[PDB]
């Protein structure tokens, strides 16, 4: 909340400094000076406010963010891959169950004793 | 170890089936309560020795089968346990050249 | 935590860029110190955008690790099935032996 607002203010100050450097000498250098000083003070504030919290994100998440993609991209691909994997193992298990049922029917056709013992198992 | 090619898988079925292979199945043989030495204590009974040499003993001298054909240990039994054209082939138990 | 360390590193990089802009404006030309300051400002803006992206990644959906753990469990189950097959293979090696 407040940290996001501080980051947005820092981005706005950076944009203003870039515009002042790109424009003309008329732009007050003292104005950009005070802006940089306030940005440093706000960064020290951004720090102090965020110095004891969270502690997570040990993932290539940074690589995906720096890989010209948002979680709305690389994270989506990872979730889709995980969903494909989980759907595939379910198909594996279902086909295994079908083959087991087929062989159970065949072994019931083979021996009546086996039919009785698998009925006891069930 | 991937295998699973339709051709690779098809070879497996033929090789496995070849080694393994209306009933035409051997006559069921039940309990044997009197064994010739320990069970009946009839060791050296002369009737038993005569029976093994010439008489048909269902399990000591041969396999009865169904349809009545009698197969001795030296002979090879051809039988068809599944209801299919393919027939199981018991090679001779003794195989004395 | 980690975002705090990233913000501290960004502040240190901004201080280094300010020192470099000082050196450029001091030994740099009038049309050179301004360009160096603009480049340092663009770098600082890129760092701030990266920090905002890091915050959005720390937020948004917090199930990425859950999905990764589910995929790891599925892979472990598949590896267990493969190990079962290899155990059957070594068992049949011992059998043919």
């Amino acid at each position: 909340h407040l940290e996001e607002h501080l980051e947005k203010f820092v981005e706005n100050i950076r944009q203003l400094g870039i515009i002042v450097s790109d424009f003309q000498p008329s732009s007050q250098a003292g104005l950009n000076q005070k802006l940089n000083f306030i940005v440093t003070g706000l960064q020290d504030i951004d720090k102090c406010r965020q110095q004891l919290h969270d502690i997570t994100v040990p993932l290539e998440v940074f690589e995906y963010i720096d890989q010209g993609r948002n979680p709305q991209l690389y994270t989506k691909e990872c979730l889709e891959r995980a969903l494909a994997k989980n759907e595939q193992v379910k198909g594996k298990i279902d086909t295994m169950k079908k083959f087991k049922s087929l062989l159970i029917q065949e072994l019931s056709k083979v021996f009546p004793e086996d039919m009785a013992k698998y009925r006891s198992i069930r | 170890l991937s295998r699973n090619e339709i051709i690779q898988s098809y070879l497996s079925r033929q090789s496995s089936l070849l080694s393994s292979s209306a009933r035409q199945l051997h006559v069921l043989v039940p309990q044997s309560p009197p064994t010739d030495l320990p069970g009946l204590t009839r060791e050296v009974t002369q009737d038993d020795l005569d029976r093994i040499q010439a008489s048909q003993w269902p399990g000591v001298n041969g396999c009865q089968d169904t349809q009545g054909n009698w197969y001795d240990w030296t002979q090879c039994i051809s039988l068809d346990p599944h209801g299919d054209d393919g027939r199981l082939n018991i090679l001779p138990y003794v195989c004395l050249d | 935590r980690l975002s705090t360390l990233i913000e501290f590193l960004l502040h240190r990089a901004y201080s280094e860029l300010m020192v470099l802009t000082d050196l450029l404006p001091r030994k740099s030309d009038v049309e050179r110190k301004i360009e160096i300051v603009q480049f340092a400002s663009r770098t600082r803006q890129l760092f701030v955008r990266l920090l905002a992206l890091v915050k959005w990644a720390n937020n948004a959906g917090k199930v990425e690790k859950c999905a990764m753990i589910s995929s790891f469990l599925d892979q472990q189950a598949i590896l267990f099935v493969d190990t079962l097959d290899r155990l059957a293979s070594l068992a049949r090696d011992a059998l043919v032996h």
């Binding site: 086909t95 295994m96 | 496995s16 138990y93 | 099935v81 059998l95």
Partner: peptide, 25 residues
């Protein structure tokens, strides 16, 4: 005969193996 029986038992056990392998594949 007995060698055929041993080979048949081994092929039966392998049957399990190949079937499960195919399934996982």
């Amino acid at each position: 005969r007995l060698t055929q029986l041993q080979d048949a038992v081994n092929s039966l056990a392998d049957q399990f193996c190949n079937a499960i392998g195919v399934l996982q594949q």
